[PDB]
Design a protein around this ligand. Sequence first.
Ligand SMILES: CN[C@@H]1[C@@H](O)[C@@H](O[C@@H]2[C@@H](O)[C@H](O[C@H]3O[C@H](CN)CC[C@H]3N)[C@@H](N)C[C@H]2N)OC[C@]1(C)O
Ligand SMILES: [Mg+2]
Length: 267
Amino acid sequence: TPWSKSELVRQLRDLGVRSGDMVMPHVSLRAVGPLADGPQTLVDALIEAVGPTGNILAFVSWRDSPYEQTLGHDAPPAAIAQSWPAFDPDHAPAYPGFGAINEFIRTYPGCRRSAHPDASMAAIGPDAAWLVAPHEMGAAYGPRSPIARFLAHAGKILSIGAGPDAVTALHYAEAVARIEGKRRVTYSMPLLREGKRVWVTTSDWDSNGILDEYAAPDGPDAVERIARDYLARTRVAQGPVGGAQSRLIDAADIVSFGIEWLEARHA
Ligand SMILES: CN[C@@H]1[C@@H](O)[C@@H](O[C@@H]2[C@@H](O)[C@H](O[C@H]3O[C@H](CN)CC[C@H]3N)[C@@H](N)C[C@H]2N)OC[C@]1(C)O
Ligand SMILES: [Mg+2]
């Protein structure tokens, strides 16, 4: 049998999602298994589980982010710059590599979307406008970003069959850690500003490895190493959602652990 909305709500409640919570899900739909109405069923169950006062925040990004094509240039190359679509928050699809559920979240009625084209965050709930803005170039996952507000707002991370590399909020620990040698990237995004396309060039912390030893692609990064150490050392609610082994993590706790872990290892 495929899982019904009501069964997933029950499981989410057994795991510890309460009415009013602020949740950031990371979902492997393959693990979950078959759903009554496809992925919309799990979206629907999440919304019901947090209730009319709860909030959902998701890292959705942008299917057509020109990140690789502009990485390391002081300006977009000319082929890119002439023809690349400007980021349109109402219509730009989610990046499919961060989870097929994110396109269902972002198109949910009333969903708000953040303005950062590559780091774009979507939010549903009464606090959604406050969560998603500001979201400036140069502040992808660190202070002043939606992640920072989620951490101040008692956020919980819900990992539904996702691995320890999927914990986006740990890039906040990388941004703020007082460690030597932190990598930075320079890249360019096409924004829509008063109906016109504008290319904006920025630098930010490298989200694909904050130090050279975390930057191999083959290759656990710091997010994954922190999360694995954390999960070995901490009591975390664990249980099934659909067919997937799921965890509910206190986001402020895991980020604090991450800052200490990084600062304890790098001089
Ligand atoms: C949509 N643009 C994205 C861009 O935002 C960024 O994406 C990274 C992503 O590669 C990392 O994750 C990826 O690489 C990790 C090891 N490097 C392992 C997990 C894997 N999903 C995330 N932890 C942070 C994102 N911003 O670099 C890759 C990309 C596709 O160009
Ligand atoms: Mg509230």
